[PDB]
Design a protein around this ligand. Structure first.
Ligand SMILES: CC1([C@@H](NC(=O)[C@H](CS)NC(=O)CCC[C@H](N)C(=O)O)C(=O)O)CC1
Ligand SMILES: [Fe+2]
Length: 329
């Protein structure tokens, strides 16, 4: 058998309030989890995840092949050269099971200065026809802001955990310019399930997505109640239990960089499971020009021998690298 990973449930509700002592006690829990397996479940987060799951299901199960081509990113549709990040990521029956829809900051409108400048990693979202998907765009945009709010609170906890003032990360995480993304991933039930869509780890474990570190500051994830994630620890890969009432939180490699690996970006992978399920990550990305000076909370003077890295450089490079390593999703 595989051992269960220690993934504590942390009540993050104090991070929304003004009880500074209570917030420090939450920060300690975040610190402990970040130094151990690198994962925790945020609970009492205030988001209606059942409704998220329902609205997402309605979308995934009603969108048609025609609509998927019309929304497709450039990896699937050469006509859509501006869609690198935002849009539909098609399945390939017989070969690739997973499919998804990615959207960015709703404030990235045609008149946004970064869109006007054609700055890499900024795109205007694409949406299905309102009549075919009533309420979907409005729901999805509101969800962006709901999970943005949770993420801002979590970033206050991480800042306090690292010995900083609570706005240390959050001051770089702004509605007008965040590069954060939501991905609505559908993992299907298939009978038969094509072997070509199943990868095999060195240890024999059947996978849907190979080992990686996240391209993010932190990742704020909702998934269905079907166990699938594994984290590499000193004791080997361990199973992360599912909890469809909480958000699974972990650091990405930008946090590892900033903290000189005090908070590592945990290596994790997705087991193959033949089950109809959802994986709905929010990747907490900063602004394109955001630079946080790296530091080291294990060193008396706090200094690090790492060089400052702008978030935009980090993100553009990381997303390409992840595609090269683990494939176009
Ligand atoms: C592990 C998990 C998901 N995998 C993923 O989402 C994987 C590894 S974290 N992530 C990516 O491919 C990066 C997608 C970035 C997105 N297009 C953007 O432009 O911002 C899965 O396979 O379920 C939930 C996050
Ligand atoms: Fe990941």
């Amino acid at each position: 058998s595989v051992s269960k990973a220690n993934v504590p449930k942390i009540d993050v509700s104090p991070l929304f309030g003004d009880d500074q002592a209570a917030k420090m006690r939450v920060a300690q829990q975040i610190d402990a989890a970040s130094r151990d397996t690198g994962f925790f479940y945020a609970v009492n987060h205030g988001i209606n995840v059942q409704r998220l799951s329902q609205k997402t299901k309605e979308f995934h199960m009603s969108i048609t092949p025609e609509e998927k081509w019309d929304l497709a990113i450039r990896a699937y549709n050469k006509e859509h050269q501006d869609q690198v990040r935002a849009g539909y990521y098609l399945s390939i029956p017989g070969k690739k099971a997973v499919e998804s829809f990615c959207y960015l900051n709703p404030n990235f409108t045609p008149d946004h200065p970064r869109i006007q400048a054609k700055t890499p990693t900024h795109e205007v979202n694409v949406w299905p026809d309102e009549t075919k998907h009533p309420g979907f765009q409005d729901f999805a945009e509101q969800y962006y802001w709901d999970v943005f709010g949770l993420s801002s609170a979590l970033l206050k906890g991480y800042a306090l955990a690292l010995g900083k003032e609570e706005n240390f990360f959050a001051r770089h995480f702004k509605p007008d310019d965040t590069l954060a993304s939501v991905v609505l991933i559908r993992y299907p039930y298939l009978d038969p399930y094509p072997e070509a869509a199943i990868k095999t780890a060195a240890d024999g474990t059947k996978l849907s997505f190979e080992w990686h570190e996240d391209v993010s500051l932190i990742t704020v994830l909702y998934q269905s109640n079907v166990q699938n994630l594994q984290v590499e620890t000193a004791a080997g890969y361990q199973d992360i239990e599912a909890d469809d009432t909480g958000y699974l939180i972990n650091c990405g490699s930008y946090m590892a960089h900033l903290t000189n690996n005090y908070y590592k970006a945990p290596i994790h992978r997705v087991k193959w499971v033949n089950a109809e399920r959802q994986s709905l990550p929010f990747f907490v990305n900063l602004g394109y020009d955001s630079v946080i000076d790296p530091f080291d909370p294990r060193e008396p003077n706090g200094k690090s021998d790492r060089e400052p890295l702008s978030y935009g450089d980090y993100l553009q490079n990381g997303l390409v690298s992840l595609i090269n390593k683990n494939g176009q999703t």
